[PDB]
Paper text:
Serine hydroxymethyltransferase (SHMT) produces 5,10-methylenetetrahydrofolate (CH2-THF) from tetrahydrofolate with serine to glycine conversion. Here, we investigated SHMT as an antibacterial target using E. faecium and (+)-SHIN-1. DLS measurements indicated that the hydrodynamic radius of efmSHMT was 4.209 nm with an evaluated molecular weight of 97.2 kDa (theoretical monomer molecular weight is 44.7 kDa), suggesting efmSHMT forms a dimer in solution.
In the structure of the efmSHMT/Ser/(+)-SHIN-1 ternary complex, the serine residue on PLP formed hydrogen bonds with E53 and H122. H122 is located on the 115-loop, and this hydrogen bond stabilises the loop. Structural analysis revealed that (+)-SHIN-1 forms several hydrogen bonds with amino acids in the 115-loop. Loop stabilisation contributes to the binding affinity of (+)-SHIN-1 to efmSHMT. Furthermore, the competitive binding assay showed that the binding affinity of (+)-SHIN-1 to efmSHMT was enhanced under coexistence with Ser when compared with Gly, while that of Me-THF did not change. However, there were no direct interactions between (+)-SHIN-1 and Ser complexed with efmSHMT.
Numbering used by the authors:
A (entry chain A): 3 to 411
B (entry chain B): 2 to 412
């Protein structure tokens, strides 16, 4: 009824609802939040200005909003064991912006993971604030094993003498050894920052080593494997850093927090404390490993580094005679959503790429088990091997319909 | 009902905040009540979509319908303010201003911006904010006697300091801002002009405040103050080269994925503001504000900064009552009237004590308050602050608040 005033907007949202229902979402950074998370984001908390921190706000009327933010803060400490948490960052990018401000000065040397090797844009890309503001030096992966070589990282750190080392990634499927990163940073007198955005849910479930005890500052988003609303978060065990973090977020780089989104964070953090979340996180990894097995045994879908320890995988598609952009377009035509993605030592443009990234958090939330993840990987192989054969692409599109109807939203 | 069972802590707190919004007078000048549609958009499944890039130029697929939503927000923003280009992705007004500075100046450049005590925003050059840390801000303020901007003093400052950029706009300034004169001063010294119209955006949309968009190289705003939309930011320009720098600065410059469920809410609110009834709402905001100023002017103890309002807000120096702004804020909150303490021009107290409070009418006007009701609010505020903790008087104020909130219920 409130929809009648604006039929064009609500029609577009209606089609987006159907698109999420009918497509297989394999974008590693996406998920489906609960009804309760969306209700919190749709709450009247959007009306409240609440700059400052609980008990020390710059506006009247915040005494009940402060409960909501305290719940999000305290549940983050329960989930990750951090002594201090800041839940106001609007995004992972803002969380990383504030983390750097608390740790280094403009122009300082920072060692972070190269984008082609799997790092995030905010880990030193020259088109991002990170590369523009600080002197970033990149580390990568080994050309043959495509995993991090910690002796090479050590050599790099000693050569460049960074003030800060950043660990974490957007497209790295293997266990990150935070203990070794901390050893290297200590060796050269650098601080350590970990961006666990992609693996935060796995960390919360005990299925990836926890960076919080090792890093000066841990950042994360709330909307990937944590299955919360879109937003950021910063964690630390040092009260001196917590004060700099809090000042950097506000008044440093943000103004009013999004308290309806922070309520969604509180909701999602409590869901993550439930034992069911550990089973969900176990299923994520089992599903990713099952898919990786199919791609390892298929002709032309080369899995970067040959295995996965977490929720995602990179597929090199060069032997199929296509680039990542064409692989993404083929799979879209059969209702399978991935993203083109640079692979280690990428030689093509970042907008063409030699690969695609696939992750299992979203389909696992829909209910997919290992046999269903196997079927998904077989449909992906079939569609990419079907050199424009309309008969086989329609068979794949049929198999996708079978899966989406088997696991509705 | 069932999802609320899993988490009583969270949902009981939200229920208490619903009751507080219903039962209080919300006089925070930057707050409003958004429509059911706006909140439904924010509560939609668009929160699940990663959509980095811009409509038609995303970095990956599945964005066909998100592109429709974001283009609706862009197109209605263009129509609302008459701008040739809009960027609707900024997470907030602070992010909008961050990206606007990146499109206009280089780190270390000299910028003229309104002093915080004089009414400017933190992002207009405060040294504890990224603005004051990243650029060389020279502040202009208001005159000590009239408490309004002296444009000859701005011109003198501009000529003396040769700024690369002049910033106009305010958080706690109740008078009309003469954008034409800012453009004249910027042209004279060869500076660019940036206008942050967050507070007055809805008044501008309604033609009730001079429009900065024709005069400013870049105009920024929030969507949640007088525009009555979701919490977020927006950037406008008529220059195609600037529009490209703006888009690059927002992403991949300072943000990652946009909040498309919030952007859906921006589209909803922009169409609401395009309705003719939004003009009548905006007229009533100003008439209510002027009605309150007349009451505060007559009352001894509540000194209105500059003695008048041209827009939605007023700044009240409370020192003659023997209290500071923090004490006034907590007196009012104890009788269910919600304001914020606020520095006044040439503020002599700590920024966390302050000499004043700030009051605005957009929220109560959205509830349906007319000039008669606005007069009654101002009388209640005067009575609470003069009561010197006489509980007879304070309880009468609480009754008056309850009378008004029941006369004008939410939804
Ligand atoms: C958007 C983004 N932010 N951080 C990222 C991305 C990714 C991405 C994807 C693409 C696809 O056209 C381009 C870029 C890009 C990088 C530099 C310049 C221009 C474009 C980046 C992915 C994970 C979304 C990417 C890859 N590849 C990984 N490594 O990190
Ligand atoms: C939060 C904010 N952002 N931009 C603003 C604010 C205001 C505000 C209020 C307060 C209340 O104790 C303190 C500060 C403050 C300024 C500098 C350093 C430390 C604190 C600022 C108002 C509009 C919310 C304010 C005032 N006064 C001005 N004019 O603009
Ligand atoms: C490690 C890490 N840190 C930060 C961010 C940025 O989060 P934001 O999109 O909330 O700004 C991302 C987003 N990652 C997205 C691309 O932006 C992805 O598809 O993987 C990230 O992976
Ligand atoms: C002119 C202007 N520009 C920018 C911003 C920042 O918007 P944000 O809170 O969405 O970051 C504000 C916020 N204004 C708030 C204080 O932060 C207020 O209560 O007035 C503003 O007034």
């Amino acid at each position: 009824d409130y929809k009648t005033f604006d039929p064009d907007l609500w029609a577009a949202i209606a089609k987006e609802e159907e698109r999420q229902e009918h497509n297989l979402e394999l974008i590693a950074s996406e998920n489906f939040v609960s009804e309760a998370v969306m209700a919190a984001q749709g709450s009247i908390l959007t009306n409240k200005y609440a700059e400052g921190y609980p008990g020390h706000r710059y506006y009247g009327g915040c005494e009940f909003v402060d409960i909501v933010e305290n719940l999000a803060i305290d549940r983050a400490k329960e989930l990750f064991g951090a002594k201090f948490a800041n839940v106001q960052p609007h995004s992972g990018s803002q969380a990383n912006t504030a983390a750097y401000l608390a740790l280094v000065e403009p122009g300082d040397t920072i060692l972070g993971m190269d984008l082609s090797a799997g790092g995030h844009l905010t880990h030193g890309s020259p088109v991002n604030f990170s590369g523009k503001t600080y002197h970033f030096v990149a580390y990568g992966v080994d050309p043959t094993t495509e995993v991090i070589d910690y002796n090479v990282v050590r050599i790099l750190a000693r050569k460049h003498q960074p003030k800060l080392i950043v660990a974490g990634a957007s497209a790295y499927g293997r266990t990150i050894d935070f203990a070794k990163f901390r050893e290297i940073a200590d060796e050269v007198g650098a601080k350590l920052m970990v961006d666990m955005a992609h693996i935060a849910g796995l960390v919360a479930a005990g299925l990836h080593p926890n960076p919080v005890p090792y890093a000066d500052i841990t950042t994360t988003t709330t909307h990937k494997t944590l299955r919360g609303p879109r937003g950021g978060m910063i964690l630390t065990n040092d009260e001196a850093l917590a004060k700099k973090i809090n000042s950097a977020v506000f008044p440093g780089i943000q103004g009013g927090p999004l308290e309806h989104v922070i309520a969604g964070k509180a909701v999602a953090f409590k869901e993550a404390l439930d034992p069911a979340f550990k089973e969900y996180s176990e299923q994520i990894i089992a599903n990713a490993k099952a898919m990786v097995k199919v791609f390892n045994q298929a002709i032309g879908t080369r899995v970067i580094s040959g295995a996965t320890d977490n929720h995602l995988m990179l597929i090199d598609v060069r032997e199929l005679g296509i680039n990542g952009k064409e692989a993404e377009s083929i799979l879209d035509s059969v209702n399978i959503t991935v993203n083109k993605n640079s692979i280690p030592f990428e030689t093509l443009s970042p907008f063409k790429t030699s690969g695609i990234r696939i992750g299992t958090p979203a389909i696992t939330t829909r209910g997919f088990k290992e046999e269903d993840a196997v079927k998904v990987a077989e449909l992906v192989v079939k569609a990419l091997q079907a050199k424009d054969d309309n008969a086989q692409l329609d068979e794949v599109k049929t198999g996708v319909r079978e899966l989406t109807e088997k696991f509705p939203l």
